[PDB]
Amino acid sequence: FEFDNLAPMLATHGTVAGLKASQWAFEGKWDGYRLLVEADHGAVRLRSRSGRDVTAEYPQLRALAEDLADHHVVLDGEAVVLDSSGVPSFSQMQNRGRDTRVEFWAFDLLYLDGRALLGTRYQDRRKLLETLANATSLTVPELLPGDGAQAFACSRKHGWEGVIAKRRDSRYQPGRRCASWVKDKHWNTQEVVIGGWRAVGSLLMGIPGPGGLQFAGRVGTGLSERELANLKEMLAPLHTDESPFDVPLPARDAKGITYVKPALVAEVRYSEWTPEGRLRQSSWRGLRPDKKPSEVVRE
Ligand SMILES: [Cl-]
Ligand SMILES: [Cl-]
Ligand SMILES: [Mg+2]
Ligand SMILES: [Zn+2]
Ligand SMILES: [Zn+2]
């Protein structure tokens, strides 16, 4: 066990709805600096996610190590600066001053009082982490209740960005992006090509593929009836005689359609993908004129 050999375990981008609590623990996903912390009987050493020794950058985490002075521990967690709603924030961290309060939100325990825990399964490491949290002033955010969807909704209600789901049977793999950690944000972003519009109520999105655009759904949230009229104006120069989609559109979506040349990229916000390659809960984030349809890719 060499603390200066350790690098953070990493999460796989994915979906948590459908995951079962009996197999997965659900943690809130926050923005901040990932930190490995050694608190050795009062002394503190800190490593950034890239392995730099950042001990001197956080003098205030000395108090943490003193509070944990009965123990020698290695902790994984997130250094965080909260906004006024109490939610960790990236720009608050970026704009940090000498006096701004930085909290350390712990979410793994890698070593405890002589015992190394990399080979120990999450369920068990987590139980020990809680014990520390209950006996000292270490901040250990709580797990989210329920199965995937419920946990996701809880996270949302906290104002949090998303969930990291971790397999209860899983070991800690330093430096590795692992399928046993899945990270999922409430809101995501995707570039799309506009293939048409529909009665104006909405726009038709697609992803370039073999034989044309793969249909991605429709978008007309994030905008009003005035803005819709504008898009109709802007897009007229681009009417076409070929459908840009690889395959006939579904009937609902085909009713009252005007195809345009697949020339324009938009950015859209959305929740998740559907099994048939559609984007749920789309909202408009604007055309992106300098972007190329040919480099639009499912991100
Ligand atoms: Cl990650
Ligand atoms: Cl942007
Ligand atoms: Mg060494
Ligand atoms: Zn984030
Ligand atoms: Zn963007």
Q: How was this structure determined?
A: X-ray
Q: Tell me: do 70 and 122 sit in the same domain.
A: yes
The CA 86 to ligand 5 mean position distance, Å, reads 26
Same domain, 27 and 146: yes
Give the CATH number for residue 174.
3.30.1490.70
Give the total number of structural domains in the chain: 3
Q: Indicate if 13 and 148 belong to the same structural domain.
A: yes
Please, are residues 77 and 35 in contact by the beta-carbon 8 Å criterion?
A: yes
116 bridge partner residues: 111
Residues 15 and 53 in one domain: no
- Active-site entry in 29, 166, 183, 261: 29
Q: Let me know: does 180 contact 167? Beta carbons within 8 Å.
A: yes
Give residue 49's domain range: 32-141
Task: Give the span between the Cα atoms of 29 and 177, in whole angstroms.
Answer: 16
Secondary element (H or E) of residue 264: none
Q: How far is the CA of 140 from the centre of ligand 1 (A)?
A: 18
Among all bound ligands, the one having the nearest atom to the CA of 3 is: 3
Q: Name the domain boundary from 78, 113, 141.
A: 141
146 and 234 together in one domain: no
CB hemisphere CA count around 55 (13 angstroms): 9
Q: For residue 288, which phi and psi values (nearest 5 degrees)?
A: -125, 80
Give the resolution in Å.
2.4
Ligand 5 centroid vs 293 CA: distance in angstroms?
15
Contacts of residue 222, Cβ cutoff 8 Å, sequence gap at least 6: 268, 269, 282, 283, 284, 285
Which of 153, 186, 219 corresponds to the end of one domain? 186
Which residues are CB-neighbours of 135 under 8 A, at least 6 positions away? none
Ligand 5 centroid vs 81 CA: distance in angstroms?
24
CATH of the domain at 262: 2.40.50.140
Q: Are residue 180 and residue 211 in the same domain, yes or no?
A: no
| 29 is known as an active-site residue | yes
Q: Are residues 162 and 268 in the same domain?
A: no
CB 285 within 8 A of CB 222: yes
113 and 70 in a single domain? The answer is yes
For residues 38 and 25, membership in a common domain is answered with no
Q: What is the DSSP letter of 123?
A: H
CATH number at residue 75: 3.30.470.30
Residues belonging to the binding site for Mn(2+) are 31, 161
Distance 178 CA to ligand 3 centre (A): 26
φ, ψ of residue 232 to 5 degrees: the values are: -60, -40
Instruction: Round to whole Å and give the CA distance between 31 and 79.
Output: 9
Annotated binding site: 31, 161
Distance CA 144, CA 152 (A): 8
Are 5 and 125 found together in one domain?
no
**Of the bound ligands, which one is closest to the alpha carbon of residue 31?**
4
62 and 116 inside one domain: yes
Look up residue 255 and give its DSSP letter. Answer: T
Same domain, 262 and 117: no
Identify which ligand lies nearest to the alpha carbon of 45: 3
3-state helix, strand, coil in the chain (%, to 5): 20, 35, 40
Distant-in-sequence contacts of 41-50, Cβ < 8 A, 24+ apart? 41/69, 41/70, 41/71, 41/72, 42/66, 42/69, 45/3, 47/3, 47/4, 47/6, 47/7, 49/7, 49/8, 50/7
